[PDB]
């Protein structure tokens, strides 16, 4: 029973020459929350130019009609009260907080000592509950975190532990790790903090963002971020539509996603987002399809042909 | 130091609407042996409509040229003289024998005894070597047999170790093996026959062939086959372009695949082909490439932006 958080309208948002309009995500949200039936939906970040700003709100007013407000997710930032007032701006309930999972990436880009930075981060996290809002943490980076910097990594994740968030993603950010390095990441955190709920979050660079994703289902992880065809910024995120499959049918853990759905949201972002997909594309491609040869990845079952 | 052997122009002619001239499949082979330096290509099937016939011969009388006729090999079938014959014309010089791997397979197509099919398939392996060509034998539907009919397949296996071939093909001709099944059935075969040249061959039905691949990498494997952009019937099959980067950057193993003819064999069979490959596709895609955020894979490696 694994929680599935779609990043398509706001990581995915990030491809270049994609750019949603507010029907556009409007649409797409209620797709994919009322009929694939994914978990959350990230659909947006914090402080983008307003406009996204009016999007979220008109989002959020729906939302609360379907009595599904905590389901929505914002992408923030470490920027004291900006992301926070933003987001309680926008009528969103949950934050999703950036923090650098690398000492790498903590240096080269703020100058600042774990301690020092840890200390923004106990801020925006009391800011936010201080404004109503819920927050989970992104350890950015954190697959060059746990291989090169794990010291920085296992205070980050310490420090974490005693705030009082809902969520730890863990993700491949620059998309570089192979199953075994995804298991055994996922496995040293989970088997310090056996009660906290990490999701992994991988990056299909070489390909192999769903291996990775089943092996983070194997050491531990509560939940799954991915995208509706893998959009997403280089090589995209998780496939969405290859991630549910093959765990419904490779792994013992399962998914509240409806699969007969699963054709209609492919072809629904491919559409809005102006990105399209190769007709061999797994699960969703046109020509993908086509009883000696029976594969259990039936066209019907992803409601197709018919 | 593992064989990389292209089905591009074979498998993936079987892909809809994908049809290659004899002008194509001539520079096709050309480019992958000569620049990408993939070790050996699966041309053709034998008894195609003639045509296909005079296509072989074509790339048989060059690639004599090129001292190197022992690199093409054609996909053959179990019907006695007839796909012999049609080699022994075609100027090539190795088989690749389709055999049913599967019991289930055997049975609903043919309907024999397998020491009934085992006699017909030494049959084919003695005259082709009567003939003058070398033999590497497909286990067709392997996936589901090792898994359903074990049985059936180790008697396979142990009958063909008596005949005189090159390489055993374990495919996952339906593309439904997961990384752990495909580490055990490719570690069943390898620690019974030791001294064997066994080759996996993948497909990408759930996004897993190269993740596949690299476990049976690890259960023993020599050689792997794969097509340029996937291309094949279904989903296709492994991607040559990520399984590639991936060996080399994943894996202690190695490869004499040249990357930086790899963006060019792309955009190659792309156009000849006809089937698009998305902007996001891994390594090869349009926008796949756009230092604090210094990703392995980088453009000027794969002979692009520079
Ligand atoms: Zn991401
Ligand atoms: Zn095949």
Known sequence: RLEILDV??????????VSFSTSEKLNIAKFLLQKLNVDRVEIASARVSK???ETVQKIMEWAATEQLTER?????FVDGNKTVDWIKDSGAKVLNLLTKGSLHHLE?????????????????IEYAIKSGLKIN???????????????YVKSLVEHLSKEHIERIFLPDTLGVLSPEETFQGVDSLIQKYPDIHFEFHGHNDYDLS????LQAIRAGVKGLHASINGLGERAGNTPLEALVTTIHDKSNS????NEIAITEASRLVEVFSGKRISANR???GEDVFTNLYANPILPERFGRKR
């Open 210 to 213: 769903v291996a990775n994703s």
């Open 108 to 124: 080269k880009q703020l100058g600042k000592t774990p301690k020092e930075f840890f200390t923004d981060v106990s801020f925006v």
């Open 72 to 76: 929505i997710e914002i992408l923030g």
């Open 282 to 284: 797994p699960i969703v």
């Open 254 to 257: 399962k998914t509240n996603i």
């Open 137 to 151: 943490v992104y350890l950015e980076d954190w697959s060059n975190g746990f291989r090169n910097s794990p010291d």
């Open 8 to 17: 398509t309208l706001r990581d995915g948002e990030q491809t270049r020459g």
């Open 51 to 53: 406009g996204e700003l």
